[PDB]
Amino acid sequence: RECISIHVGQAGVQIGNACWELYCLEHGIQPDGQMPSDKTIGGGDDSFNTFFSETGAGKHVPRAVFVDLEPTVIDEVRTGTYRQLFHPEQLITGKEDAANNYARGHYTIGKEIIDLVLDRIRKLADQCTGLQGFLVFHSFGGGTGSGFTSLLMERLSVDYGKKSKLEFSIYPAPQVSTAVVEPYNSILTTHTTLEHSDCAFMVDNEAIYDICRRNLDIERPTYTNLNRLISQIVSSITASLRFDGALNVDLTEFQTNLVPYPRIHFPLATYAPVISAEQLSVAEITNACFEPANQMVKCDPRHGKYMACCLLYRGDVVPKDVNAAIATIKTKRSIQFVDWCPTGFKVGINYQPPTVVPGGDLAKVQRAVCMLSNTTAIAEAWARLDHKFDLMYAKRAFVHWYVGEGMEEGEFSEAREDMAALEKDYEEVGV
Amino acid sequence: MREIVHIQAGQCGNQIGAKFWEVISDEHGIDPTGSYHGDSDLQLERINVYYNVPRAILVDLEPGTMDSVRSGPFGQIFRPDNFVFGQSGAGNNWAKGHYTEGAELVDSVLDVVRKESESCDCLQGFQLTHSLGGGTGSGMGTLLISKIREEYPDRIMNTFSVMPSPKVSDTVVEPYNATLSVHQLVENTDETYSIDNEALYDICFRTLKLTTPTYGDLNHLVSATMSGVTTCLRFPGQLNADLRKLAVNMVPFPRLHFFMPGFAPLTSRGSQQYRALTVPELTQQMFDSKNMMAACDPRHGRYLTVAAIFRGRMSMKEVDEQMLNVQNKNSSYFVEWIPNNVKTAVCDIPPRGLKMSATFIGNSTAIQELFKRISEQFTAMFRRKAFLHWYTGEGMDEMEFTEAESNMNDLVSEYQQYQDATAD
Amino acid sequence: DLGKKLLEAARAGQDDEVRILMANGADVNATDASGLTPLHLAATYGHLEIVEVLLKHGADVNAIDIMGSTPLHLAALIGHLEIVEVLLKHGADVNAVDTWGDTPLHLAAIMGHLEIVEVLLKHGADVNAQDKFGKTAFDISIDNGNEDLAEILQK
């Protein structure tokens, strides 16, 4: 029943912040943890209890761990609007960060805090009676988001061998990039996490950036802007876990519904509608799901094949209108499945109006939809990273920083070769 | 990554060091007594980086330096226990600073260093200001660096190193001292800001129209540079915020860690800088040789990596646009095999006297022009063996000159290699 | 040996000791292991009065060492303006080329001794003289980006 969220590094922590604020708003939970609707356990078997535990005082506490090799970002958490939402033992910090170096996050610095983190996770798992697994939020380009995440994922596959681990990965973009070696970190972490992750939702920072500029009319999007949008989509994905739906009701069903091919576990997410604060039908929002401008990852699904397709509606949505809209799209555009996949869409509806954060940039809408689709087109995202990797690695540029931090140079090649094979994997499917 | 320990050695090191402390104290609202009288939360946010009181250590084999320091405006703010001064003075002899009088005083300095290091919550590393043309700042400076490098291998070593020019000092042994120092710097520092006196003079003489540049005029430029390049360390930010993140972004190959700093606008002392520069103008100065604190032309090489810091009230949108513009319109000047090699930071707090300014930290292959200059002079002198007995008479061997010369020529060749390098 | 003593005295700058050595019949044109004369040494280390005495007592103004260095080469390199002038006055070969193909003008230019450059030029210094690498003094002022020197090289 219960899910534990782990937020790693600055990206993962700040996105965690946005997500949990949104969660509290959706569930009627106040910043101090009180919920004027629920009863004390009880009474610990409700839908939202998969994400929140209950204190004997009526306090609803996020089943979450925040981890960063530097205190600054998490210090804002224990000194903010939701400081009383988390017990301080859930907020773990070190002193020296990974300095945008995977090798420091995974090897040199990360080994000094991995046991403390695993222990704080153990406490939460101890409060669980039927732990499903973990939702792991982190960046590709950060030293901690890459290195420590891959380390933690390995150790979690050891200590909790028989349970699902899902990822929300922040894919790097030059607009908000803070490190030249971000392509290195992305490839390194994708390599050592691949066999440890069951399903991973990549968030392209450039896609989110473009959507903020275009659909929210924000000139220079900040992390707060991006995170509130990212938060809205994470919410659309985890809603079935927090609201007891009929589609994707547990973490296992995510792999079942989206990942028929273990190595190819990167669903493309598409969200609609995104409207500025300055009413679309089921058909209009459903059609927008097949508009690449609304994707969270920049790629062209017209140049790819589908392995799976889930539609996640929320709001004033009638099932008959959904099926009608699907029948239109399934016979109006050009949706191509692999021959070894049903071809039919999986539909889930949540009859609550979508929630927005007060003071946000998003309009309240009557109905929204998030399409999760496993398409081979997302291989484009990997290709781009691999291209940047190959350009630097050919000269061994900035490789000395990694070698000097407990990492062997050969681990670069091995990681890149795995990526090469992953591209081949996508190629064999889309043909 | 919080505290940086500042060290200033020799006359030049102490002059530009003093100026650094004067400039950043004014920026952080600190008065000569150490009291805060600023009016911004941003000023004290990261005050613990350079202040405890300045985390500075003052060194010279020339005792008289002490006086010039404490007779300065902010000379009273320095801890009296952090003054480590000898009784002689090396007299432009790198060997005396490196093996003889400097080696005798070095441990006294290391004690002060260690004393500051212990009371640091999270030591970033070290920051040394010095010249390479003398005996103390160059010779003893590079000794300290090796000693600290061995005692603190896991900390960043950073220097502001000023390059000798015949246009400022007509001492012929300076190419010796500089070459011997660079030999140490290439091996023992993580990042080095090359502050060329040739460039400082040229800028003062031909651009700022000063017929006779003094050290005060040169140091005006050095200080503006120093506040510019440490902006991201001293104010809350997300890019190149500590010594290690900067080095990771700036240094693709360990030996190639010598930066060509530049900034705009170029102001004179006391002058009335009116009609501040626009974002596009500041941007374009990145390729302007006249704005470089190293006497090299960026157009004569290729950028491996760049850090661009804009200070003042301006549009991040326009800054983003102009930086993209200057890159794609001058793409062949940026090495193809390092994608997205230019990082940009915008700080809301501009330097004193100016409304908007830009500082550029370049790792460019064009920096070989600097080393080529020194080497030529070193080789001119070394082939006639003039004044060599000064150095051998202090313990050195002629082989150290050869090894240093050879290593610097290797550095030049390496810059050339990556300048010709193709992505293909 | 009074020759070795004169070499050391001319280099150290002991004007009196030079006089006393030359008073016991010291060889003014004695050489060290590398062919350096007392004049080479006095001109290198800036000992004007000693330079003048040597020249007034039969010193070869255009003596070369093993490396083809004349006293003028060395005075120009180290930047002793007074001595450069005195040397030229006693018939110094302003366009002497050493083993590296360098002339006094090359060395004065490289070390940025601009006044000396001007003096050499006024005594017929060959602006078109090239070193081994094919570089002239003007080429040096251009490659090193020295506008002051390039200006004086064309006065």
Ligand SMILES: Nc1nc2c(ncn2[C@@H]2O[C@H](COP(=O)(O)OP(=O)(O)OP(=O)(O)O)[C@@H](O)[C@H]2O)c(=O)[nH]1
């Ligand atoms: N969408 C989004 N991206 C972020 C956010 N914070 C950082 N990033 C991105 O994450 C990437 C890596 O940065 P970080 O996650 O902060 O790095 P880190 O995990 O803290 O690792 P180190 O700082 O190197 O120790 C960069 O490309 C940023 O663009 C955020 O709040 N939202």
Ligand SMILES: Nc1nc2c(ncn2[C@@H]2O[C@H](COP(=O)(O)OP(=O)(O)OP(=O)(O)O)[C@@H](O)[C@H]2O)c(=O)[nH]1
């Ligand atoms: N830009 C600049 N350069 C300076 C300044 N002071 C000295 N220099 C340069 O420094 C070089 C040698 O002087 P110093 O390094 O200060 O000498 P030192 O380190 O004290 O060593 P000793 O003289 O042997 O005691 C010369 O080339 C000078 O041009 C200064 O205030 N500004």
Ligand SMILES: [Mg+2]
């Ligand atoms: Mg971080």
Ligand SMILES: [Mg+2]
């Ligand atoms: Mg001195």
